[PDB]
Every structure is written in C-alpha cells, then in structure tokens.
Design a protein around this nucleic acid. Sequence first.
RNA 1: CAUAAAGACCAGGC
Lengths: 67, 115, 98, 48, 44, 477, 51, 34, 404, 257, 98
Amino acid sequence: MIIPVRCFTCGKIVGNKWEAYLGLLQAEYTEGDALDALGLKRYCCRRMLLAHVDLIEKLLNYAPLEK
Amino acid sequence: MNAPPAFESFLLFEGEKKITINKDTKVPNACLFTINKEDHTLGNIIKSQLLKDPQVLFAGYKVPHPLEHKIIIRVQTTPDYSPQEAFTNAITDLISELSLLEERFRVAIKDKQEG
Amino acid sequence: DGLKYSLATGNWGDQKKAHQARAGVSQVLNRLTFASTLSHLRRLNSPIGRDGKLAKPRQLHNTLWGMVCPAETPEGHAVGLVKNLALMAYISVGSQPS
Amino acid sequence: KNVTLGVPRLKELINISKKPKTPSLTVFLLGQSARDAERAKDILCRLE
Amino acid sequence: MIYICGECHTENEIKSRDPIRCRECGYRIMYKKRTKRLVVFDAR
Amino acid sequence: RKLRRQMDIIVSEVSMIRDIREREIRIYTDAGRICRPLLIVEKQKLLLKKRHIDQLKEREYNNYSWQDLVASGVVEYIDTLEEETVMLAMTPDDLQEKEVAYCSTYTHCEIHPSMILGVCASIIPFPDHNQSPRNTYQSAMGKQAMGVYITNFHVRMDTLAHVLYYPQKPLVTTRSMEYLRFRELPAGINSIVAIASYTGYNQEDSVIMNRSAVDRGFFRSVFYRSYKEQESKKGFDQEEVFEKPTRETCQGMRHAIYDKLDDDGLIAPGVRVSGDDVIIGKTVTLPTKRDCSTFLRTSETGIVDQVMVTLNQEGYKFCKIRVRSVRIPQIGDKFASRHGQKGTCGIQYRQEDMPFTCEGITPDIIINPHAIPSRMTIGHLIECLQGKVSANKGEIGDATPFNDAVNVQKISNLLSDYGYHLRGNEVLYNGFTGRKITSQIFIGPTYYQRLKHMVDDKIHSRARGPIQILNRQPMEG
Amino acid sequence: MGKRVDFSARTVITPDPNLSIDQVGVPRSIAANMTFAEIVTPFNIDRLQEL
Amino acid sequence: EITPDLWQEACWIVISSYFDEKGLVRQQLDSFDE
Amino acid sequence: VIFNRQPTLHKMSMMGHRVRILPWSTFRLNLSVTTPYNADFDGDEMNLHLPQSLETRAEIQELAMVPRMIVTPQSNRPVMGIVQDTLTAVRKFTKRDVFLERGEVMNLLMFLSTWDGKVPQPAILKPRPLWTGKQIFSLIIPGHINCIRTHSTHPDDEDSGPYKHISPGDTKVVVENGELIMGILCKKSLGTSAGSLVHISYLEMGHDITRLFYSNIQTVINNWLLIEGHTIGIGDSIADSKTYQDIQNTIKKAKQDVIEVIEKAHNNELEPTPGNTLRQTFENQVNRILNDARDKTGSSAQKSLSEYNNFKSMVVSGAKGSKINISQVIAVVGQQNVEGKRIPFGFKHRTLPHFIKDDYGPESRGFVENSYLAGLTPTEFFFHAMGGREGLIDTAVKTAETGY
Amino acid sequence: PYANQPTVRITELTDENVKFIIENTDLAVANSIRRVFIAEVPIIAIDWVQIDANSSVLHDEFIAHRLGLIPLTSDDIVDKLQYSRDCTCEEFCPECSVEFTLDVRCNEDQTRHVTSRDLISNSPRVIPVTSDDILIVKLRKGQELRLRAYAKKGFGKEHAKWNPTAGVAFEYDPDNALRHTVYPKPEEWPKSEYSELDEDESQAPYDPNGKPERFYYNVESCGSLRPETIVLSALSGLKKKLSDLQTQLSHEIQSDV
Amino acid sequence: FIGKIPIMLRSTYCLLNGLTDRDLCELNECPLDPGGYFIINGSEKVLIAQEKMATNTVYVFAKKDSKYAYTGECRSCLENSSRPTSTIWVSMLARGGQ
RNA sequence: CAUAAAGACCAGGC
Ligand SMILES: [Mg+2]
Ligand SMILES: [Zn+2]
Ligand SMILES: [Zn+2]
Ligand SMILES: [Zn+2]
C-alpha cells in the first residue's frame, strides 16, 4: 500500500526514507548502495524498503467521489 | 472481542494489593511474596540480588502464566533472620546501586562532551 | 432467461430436466487473492462422481507432465478430480478440417 | 505371494464375504516329505 | 438529504419516493455523503 | 510438419501423429486438446538462434512478438498423444551436448522445466526441496492468503472482502512470479523468523508472534462486509418503503437502537455500528406497518464505509451498504509460510521478552523446529537462508525451482562474507534473564501469509436460544 | 440417536503448557454465555445474592 | 550463431514474449470469441 | 466440562476437564492431552459441553475425568505421554553432561508443585556446587517408584560382557526408591508404551499423583528448555565433504549393478525364480539392489551425524521424526512407487517423453538419486509428486471405510 | 551482602546513538536496564484521533493508526505532563495532552504528499521531529484531509508507538570464556566487534571462576528522546518502581504485624 | 431480436476491449484484472472446463465381470454441428462360456 | 421480548 512508519522488527523510522530512496535509484546507485546511503544497517530495516510494494500510485488513478 | 484492554499489565483496580505476603508451612523460616501487576523486569533484579545475601538459602520467582501479570517469589533464609528483612534489604541495596549508576553515567556524559 | 438461468444457478441443462442435467459448472469466482482468481479461472473439472472410493481416476498420470500442475489440487473427496493448469498450457480452441 | 491386509481384509472378515479377494490355504507335511524337498515336490504336484 | 453522484460528482438534493437520476448526467448511482456526527479513533 | 511450421494450409493448432507399429497416420483439428509449446531441435542444434533472442530482448517498439517467433518455425505446439512420438530434452546445454551416448535424435527441448507448475504452485520458492504433500498443501492455502486482491476495491461492492495493510513482494521470489503479477498484488509480509522452542507455546504447529510488531501494523487487516437491500412492490396495496420506523407505529419492534438512521432510513457512512445496530430501516404497509429492517451480523463491531442507493432491473430503489472492520492479528489467527507450514499463534510476547541477537534484532515470528523433521520442508530453511543473504546484498534472490546453479553451499559462501555464520545459525540472548541461549538459533527473514481463517468468526457459545420450528430443537449454524 | 444440544461452545484451540492436565483455558465470552443452574441453600445464599 | 551457457537469459526472454502476447486466461477468451 | 473433538474414535476423545478462565478467544489445554484427541494446533476446533446438574457433574468427576483415563483399556498402555519439546528437553536434560549452578536450580525447584521445600545436596560440592539433571529430575519422580528401561541407542553388547551396570554410553535406565540413578529418558521411558515409567507411576502410586508427575515434568523442563534452547538449521542437514563422496560412490555402484542385471535380461541369461514370471524376478532383483543402496547410504548418513546435530536430538528421543527422514534429507530420497510397483508406463513403453522407449534403468522408472537438501531434478520431482498423490488418496479414501 | 558498585564508559555519543559499557554489575540488573530502555521510559505519541473530512483513498483508522507511530519531541515536557489517568479534570487540559491539527486539501493537479511537517501543534516544544519528512498519506486533486489529534504521555508497555528507542544492542562476554553458549565448531563463527583475541584462535579459554561483567550496550534513539536522556529516564523510572515497592512493602509488613 | 447473450468480460465484444490504462481507470476497471468471466445479476461466474472422453476415436477396454472379454467402442458426434452423441459398442463374448 | 422459511447446489475448513 504505502511504506510503514516504524519498521516492524526493531522500530526504527523507515517511513520518511522511501521517496528519497527512489531518488537514489533514479540516478545511479544499486539497492545495496542506496540502503547504505540512507543509513539502514541491520537487515530488518533493509527488508522494509527492499521488499516494499507501493500501491498508492495505483490507487491515485481512480477519480475521487467528490470532484 | 475478548482481547483485554492494553492495561492488565500494571494499573491496579479496586481491592488488589500490590504485594501480598503468605508464610510457607512446608519449611520453617520461609516466606512467599506475591507481586501483582509486574513481570520479569523486577523479579529478575530482586532474585539476583537476594542470592548475594549469605543468609538467604532460597530465592526464586515465577510467573504462573504470562497472560496474567503476577509474580511469585519464594524466599528462605537462615534462622533468626526474617525473609521480609532480606527482601527489604535487597530493595534498598538495589536503589543504592541504581543511584550510583545514574551519577557515574552523568559524569560520563559530561566528560564525553568537551572533556 | 435460459442462458441467464443456467449460468446463474450452475445446474447445466434444461431446468425442468435439472435432475438429468449435470451440475458444477460456473461457480462464483473467488476474490480472496489475485492468485486465487488466476487459479479459479484456469481449472479442470472431471465429471466422475466425487463419492467413489476407486483410485486411478484420481492418481497422477504421466500424461499430465507440463500440461497440468502435478502439485496443485483440492483435498477432500476431490483429490485428483480437480486439476489446475500449468503456466504454458494452452487449450486448442478448434477449427475445421476444410 | 501377496495377501490383502488392513481395512479391505478387515472388511472381508467382518462381512464374512462369500468370495474373498485372496483365498489362501497353508499346508504342512507329516513325514519325510516335510524335511526333504523331493517328496515335498511330489505333494506340490499332487495339490495343484 | 444530499446524494453525491457517481458520474459527474455533482451533489443533488432529492427526496423519498423519487426515482434516482442525477440531473445533467442522467446517471443512476448515488452515494451517501459522509455524515456530520463525529466519531473518535484511537491511534493504536 | 513443414506446412504447419510455416502456417500455410495448417493452423499451428492442428496436431499430427504418426504411430509407426499400427501404420496409422492421425490428424486432429478438434477442439479441446490441451497442448503446450516446445522448442524445435534439428540434429543436435536448436533452431532458436542469437538473432531471435536479440529481437525478443528489443521486443518493445519492434512490433515483434511471440507470434512472429511461431511463424519462424522455432517453437511448436504439441499435445498429449503427440508427445508419445516425441523426444524431449530438459535443457539444451545439458542433453543436447555430447557425452557418453544416451540419445541423439532429440527433436525438442522444453523452454524451461519450472513451467510444469501451476499458478498457485509457482509462488513456492524451491519446491523441489520440499515433500510433495507440502507443495500440495501450499497450493491449497495460497488461495486463502490475505492481500490486496484487486486495485479497484474501493469502487467494488462485495461480500467478505479481506485486504492487507502492508503487502510486500518477497525477498526470495521465483522467476515466474513476474508473470503472475505477484509483485503488484502480493499477499503476505516478510518477517524475521527464529526457529526455536522458546516458552513452549509454539509446540505442535503453533507460532509465537512479537506483539510490538503487531502494534506497528504487522499482519493487520481490513474486512469489508456488504449488505444488499431491496425495496419492492408485491401485493396490490402491499409495498416496501425505506424510512425510519417510529417506536410505536410499526408492528415488529426490537429493543435495538434505530437512532442512527437518517431521514430515508439509511445509516450515513462514518458511523460506528455494533451488534443489533440497525443499518437499513425498511417497513411494509400491512393490509399498520411491519418492520423488515436488516441487522448486522452479531458482534462484528465496525464502521459503515459506504452507502449507495440506485435502481435495479425492475426499477425499484435498491440500496447497498458496505461496513468495514479492522482486525489486528490475535493469538487465535492462522498463519502459513509459503512451503506448507501452517499454525495458529500460541501467544504474543512484547519486544521486551523476545530473544535478541547481539545487534538487537528480535524475531517477529517464532516457529517450532519439530515442524521440520517429519514434514520435511527444507525449502523453508533454504529460503530462510537465501532471504538472509538477499536482505543484506540488496538483491532479491532467485528461487526458481531448478537452477542447478544455486547450491546451498554457494548461498552459505555468499552469506559468510557479510559477517554472519554461514549456516544461518546465530547467537541469541534470552529475553527474560538476558543470559545467552546455549544453542544457536536459526534466524532469517521468511515470507509469511495471513489466512482467511480467524478465531473471531469461529467462536460460538450457546445457552437456550432460538429453536427449530419442526423439531423443537436448537437451530443449526 | 444424536441431536443439536444446548450449553455447548465450539472454538479454536491453542496450546497452553502452564495449565495442568485436566484444566482448560476458557475465553471470557464462552464463559459469559454458558451458565450453570444452581440451587440456593443457607450456605450459598450470600454469594448468590452477590452474583 | 548459438546461445550456449547464456541460456538462462534466453528461456526467460522467450517466456517473457509468450506471456506478453497472450496472458493466463486466453483459453476463456478464445473459447468465447470462437 | 466434558470436552470433544470430532470424530470421536475411542472414549479417550471425550474427557471431562476443570475450567480456568483466560483472555482472548481460544480454548487452551496442556499438550500431554494432545495425543488423546489427535489434535495439532492449526485451525483445530473442539466442542465444549457443560453439565447442568450436580448429579451429572459428579458422574463426570468420578468417571470421565482425565487423570482417571490415563491408562487405556484398549492396549493396557497409558494414553498420554511426554510429547514434542518436553520429551526432547527431557533427553538432552537427562544426560550426564547437564550440570546446573545454584540459581538455575532455584528456578527449576520453584516450578515444582509437589516439591517439599528441601534443596537437595548437589552432586559436586567442591570447588563449586553443581546439581545434575538426573539429580533434579529425581525430585520429579513421585513417591518411591521402581522401573528399569533401556534407551533407544542402547546396543546389545553392553549386556554381554563387563560394564553391564556401568553402560559407558550412560544408557539403559534405573529408578530405585523414587530416584533416578542412571539412564537417558526417551519415548521408551516417559513416552507412551507398555510398562513405561508413567504407567508404573499410575499403577503403583495412583492417578492423583501421576497427574502432578506429568505437570511437573512439563513445567520444569520447559522452563529449563529456555536456557539451552532447541533449533533446526541447515547446518544440521549437511554432512561431511567425505560422506557425500561415500554416498555418491554407493549410488553409482548400485546403478552400475542395475545396468549389469538389465544387460543380463536382454540376453535372456536371467533364469526365472520358481513361482515368478521373468518380469517378477527381474523387478525383484532390481528392488533388492536399489533397497540395498538406499539402506546403506541411509546408515552412512546416520553414521555421519555429530552428537550436536539436532536431527539426531529429535529422532533418538523419538519425540518426532524417524531415521528414514534423516536418510532422505542427507543421502537419498529413494525409490518412488505408484500402487506398490515401480513407476509405470503412462506413455507407450516409456515413462516420460524424455526417456527412451524400453528403459528399465533406475532413472527412468523413478529411483530418486538426489536428496531434499541438494534438491530433486525435474523428472525426479514429477515422479515424486506421483509418489505423494497415492499417499494423499489413501488418506482421503480410507477414512470413510474406517468410520463405517 | 551488599549491592555492587558499577562503572560506565561512553565510547560513541551521537544524536542517533549511544555506546556505553557498564562494569562490575550483575547480569539481571543489566538485562533489566536494557529492558527498561523499551518498556518503562515515558514518551509522547499521538493517541486520540478525530477525523472530520477524509476523502483520501486510505480509510480513517489506517491514517489514525499511522498518526500514532509518528515520533514527537519528548526531550523536555514529558517530565512535566501527567498521565491522563492521574489527571484531575474530565477530558483534556494542557497538562495531560498536546493538541495537533491537520488541514490539507489538494488544489493542484500534481499529487500532494501529506507529511508530518503538516501537523501543527499548540505548543512550540513538540515538533513532529522536524527542526526528512514522515509521509502520512498522499492526495490526488480534489482529495482532502482535516483532523484533530491529542497526544498523551505513555510508555512502551501499553502500545509499541510509545517505544522511545530503536533496536537496543546488548552483549556480554563477547569472546566466550563462560561457555553460556557452546559452539559445536567454534572456528566457523565470526568474531564480535569487542573481541579481545587474536585471529588465529577461535575462543578464549574456559574460566570456571568467572561471571558476566563488562556489559556492552548500544542504544539507538527513534528521535523522540535524545539517546543521552533515554538511559537517564530509564534508570530514574526503574528506581521509582523500586522505591514504590519499598513503600507499599513496608506498609504491609507494618500492617500485618 | 431473438434474445440477449451474456458477454465475457474483456473478450472481443466487451466494452473493455482495446482500452489502455487511462481509459480503464476512467471506467473504474483494474488493468490487472485478467477478465474471462461473466457478470450475471451482479455475481461473477466462471465456466469451468469440463473433462470428457474424446470423440470419433475407437477404444478397447476390458471389464472384469462382463459377458465380454473385450469391449471396443466409438463415442461419435458430427462436427459438433448437432446432437449430443451416439455410442456404439463392438464387443467380443468371452470364450469361457460353459 | 419476537421475527428472519425450508431446501438445493457449490466452495472451503480438520
Ligand atoms: Mg488438526
Ligand atoms: Zn529494522
Ligand atoms: Zn451526476
Ligand atoms: Zn486534563
């Protein structure tokens, strides 16, 4: 759906690191370089960004109930 | 629907005593403490502190079930020494340690910054 | 009303003959998961009765290599009698030998 | 030699079925036919 | 009673024992316009 | 065969068979034959060459697709009873190349063997490392996993809709999942899993969940129930009308609260509705009035999401109302991995009490090790290692069933370089006393699926309630 | 020969090692609906006036 | 003009084109269309 | 409350219990009661029946209670035994090597309900006090109970010569005067079998104290099981780099022998065994060779196991799993069979399109060389699925006839 | 028969991290302190959420859920605030609560990101940890979100949103003398960052007389509490509990006798 | 006008065919939905492929207790143009007749 | 305190 705040296992904040993450991937760095540049060390944090699926961009295509 | 509210863990409602004390008839000079609304955080401390006292023959705790928040601590001491006194002395010693640890930790903080 | 009916109820045939008519066709599609939907859309149903305790209608035959999934099947009286399809399987739709 | 065992044989026993799937008869030999395989072979020919 | 349209999203005022067709889009499906009275959530 | 490979007089659909000992020659143009494509081998060499893959990798904006690959005579459709006349090779670089002679004449080679697996069986990482009944059990359970089923679900009105908050594509995925669209609509979440016997609440198939993760949104879902309601005219003067009943006008009256209804007898969305709460007021003029009004399913305790009012086939006013309830995973719910290991949650421990590594990581989910030996799912262990490599490396691992190129030993040698014990074993500290746990517990992320089955809907309790009409016995259901 | 009966509650089971052999965990809802009929005596009349 | 030992790319490119032209449910659509 | 799971096969599937109210949604029961109901915990439900009269409550209490039903009249064995974790932790806990410092003994004694309150004097007094696993477990065994059993790994050599009572492997068992002298417990001791320590506790002492025997074992050996912990990991499924060459050598030997036999049968040199068709004696010989192979490789993989390997920890105590599973994991999965025979010919005189017609060799007919750890080949995977389908079908079909 | 006197070394001190070493101490005190780092340290996080107009594609209590997991700056006023249960007045006062307000609508065609920076507080001392931006939700044009929230004082026992810290690393006896864990093959295991030993030898020789000391800690903050005051607040709270036991304990021993 | 035939979604005669992503979003349809099912009375029904024995080919089987040792048969249809089936058996009486 | 019928088929659970 949308990236969770507060990584499930440890509780670090991954919720603000999604957008900027994409930016890194948009330029050069592979995921291994981007996740280290964002400062996620223990892999319980890394699985938040690495395994995430963003469905919000899919849900924002359909027009809302009110114009 | 049957989930208990977020506090059965610490908050005490009407009538529950924090500590209840029951003597143990299986052994002379042995007592049993029941601590409502606590878990291993406190019990492990108190048990490990009661094992230093040379007059304490037995010290142990258990949670009879995790979904209930309770602690049972059995204490057996040497003759002419009440186990309640051993438990009080244990708590007082624990405070005497934690205060010192706070102060030395503050000194360490103030030293690590421009020291 | 005939097409709509025999698609609606799943009893397949004349409705006054529904006793003689075969049933089990056109179940409601499962919306639990997109995988469950893809599975329900690709499926086979053997007409052999479910109650029968005889084996080998049921068992896994060498002719099922690659056209039908060896692993996937319901569990119940239906073991081996309902067969999901392998990914590359394509049913020939038919033509004239003109 | 094979024998029906388990649930099907239990059905044959409990039902007291007229014709079982694997009827079998064991045969023992009194004399020198028992120990020697020759006379045993003779009885083998006489029972078949 | 205000029903939001399901086509042009133009709110219309309509009353009981009336057929439902939204004016100017001629569309037959309306939605109920989330209520007034306020409901509390716990952030848990 | 030439004319079919060129598709001149013969559609590629037609199958042709020469049975040599019976001297027959058969040609089937019939409908219903199940057939699959295969590569074509002339002598020892494939007809698929480098220019074909060059154009297929450039497939976008070349208007060059699979149909032009069939029109080149490279690939060919073959059905069952023609496979009796064919010789297949598993992979070209293995069975085509020369060794101590087995077979020369090979006429075909399968595209990739893992395509023999169906849709639900294609989501299993390393299915060949598992006992086959577990691949079957997983093909059964994978249909029941909660997730985001269709992206338009906000528009749709459906009964019994389960949706998961935070779906995740797996860390260990099969190459074929890409074509099941399982990246866009995953059902499940990855989790950190230590396989151990801990407090004894995971014994049998049960599973110990971290509660502090459950409070962070882990396996927390939404349940949409839909409610259909029909206004109609049947009798001459007898009609049904949407309206808010008044305490004494209508005949049938239940002590439940009608005060949530609006002027038209329909609850506005955003109202909390509980057991006995009355969603739709509906009355029937009585030749004064009768109450046909509809009630929630008992105890659901939820909020009205959406209310829509329309005209049906006949043209009467027809109202649908969708209530939704959020369900937090309990110690009664049912959780299954991707290999066929399923079980309930014995109990939930907070992050305090969960066993922790040197680095502070605590398992979200603990499963009992006795599940492994008899059930014989090793692909759960191998998956659990490949995910532990895949999380660190930044790459999503490849579990596709037959590589021959992914050894357990290679995965271990790749893990040992990141600072871990190469077998996945890792030192844990006890949660309660902080003492080290003597044995070294096996930890790694594995992808887990919440299941439709939940204890809140399976609980029932009975004291002297409604009674069957004919038998004067308690009701059924 | 068999029939649907009252004072019976079905639900899912979960392992608790901390009970005894003959005990069982009962959720509070199943324990809320299911009742036991009781006779009032001079012994229990106080407790039953409490309940 | 061969593709040895690079095969793991080839098989999945051709599978890619396959599921790109058709899809999973094509049996239904071809049955109903004919 | 009487308590039930469908179907009820025997009378131990309905047993009266003693209510205790707990949070959340689910019934909860001790796991020694697992085996009577056949239950495991995945989605299992059980009915709860409440007696409404004091008369019927007395009947249930003096007839259908669980502690009274321990020993079954069917097999004159105890129904309930130590199962899953607690049995493995009993084995590992009962070894000589287990030594316990003071506080650990304080906890384990704290979880004994029947304990007198008198701390036993440790096995090692000096330099530091150490209790032993057998020394605390001797406090569990109630009253004075007398039993002699033998551990699973106990060989038959120790009985013949010297070390009858020493048993260098710590094996056999002795329980005298309510005390455990020696021996390692397993499914053959605390588990359910004729004359097991629990059964002897039932007949000699009674049901009341036997219940507390179960419960005490459960609690104390779980709460000790926290300390060492138990696990399975890939390192437990891997053998030595030598054992792999051993196993593969044995396999290639076997397949070469099969080639020799088949090439004998092509020249007609194979003589039919009396009472057997040439196909029957051929399949007999090949089955002999292949079963010899998989058995030998199995025994090798079982000799390659370290004392630390956890597969051995589960299998030796009989808690769960069996030696054949270790064999299939480490060495060879083995021959797959459809309807009691080697994989048939679905096609015309061949099993799959890949194999050549009239191939009776080990690979074509479904002998699986690979192991679950290394992973199957595709054809061995399909043959394996065929082998499992028969099991699923038997499971589904037998139940109706058995119930009828 | 007396309490040991511990010591502390602070090695790394940053705004995200603290590495300190407690020496000459029991194991249970260590594990209990690292436990108080999670459980009992009070913090401010949003609890009470009321939504007015939600047109977003995310349903109400999903967003209301995600508002509670946003860290708030707890560095100062947590000592001042009172638990809502101990508050005198009905409902909410400035003593027991902090009010946050959210007003967003998307006028422009481009998607708008509703982030914690949009949350507005009545008091300056609590920012949503903005001195990047935690994403609350996204909004298409025409979509709108307006809501009130009250944040309270709570700690990690209640709900995980009150955990002040991220993963807390705890270690002792890094080179294994005490044999509290037994490696089947010691030569296969990498060595801890605190290892004192040469790289040729796997382990330290067995010490029968030793007991665990020199506990190595790492405390990584969530941003609500600066990691220097997480340990102080923790020790203060734990000590407060112990003093409470001494109190009510003494009262019981006096009353029953 | 003889009658209305239900339409399979996303087939050639559906209104959802040929439409790209944006159009399907304006129409509140999911681009991922594979289609291939029916909508009758609001429910979504899926015709399940029904296994049957092939037609026009001669078969030979042997039943245990039959009067026949060998039964060949042809289940035969014409083109699918008309009629359900016509089943003809050609069998060989067992020589075990006493 | 009463009404929501019954039956049919299908899917699933152990
Ligand atoms: Mg079960
Ligand atoms: Zn993390
Ligand atoms: Zn409109
Ligand atoms: Zn206030």
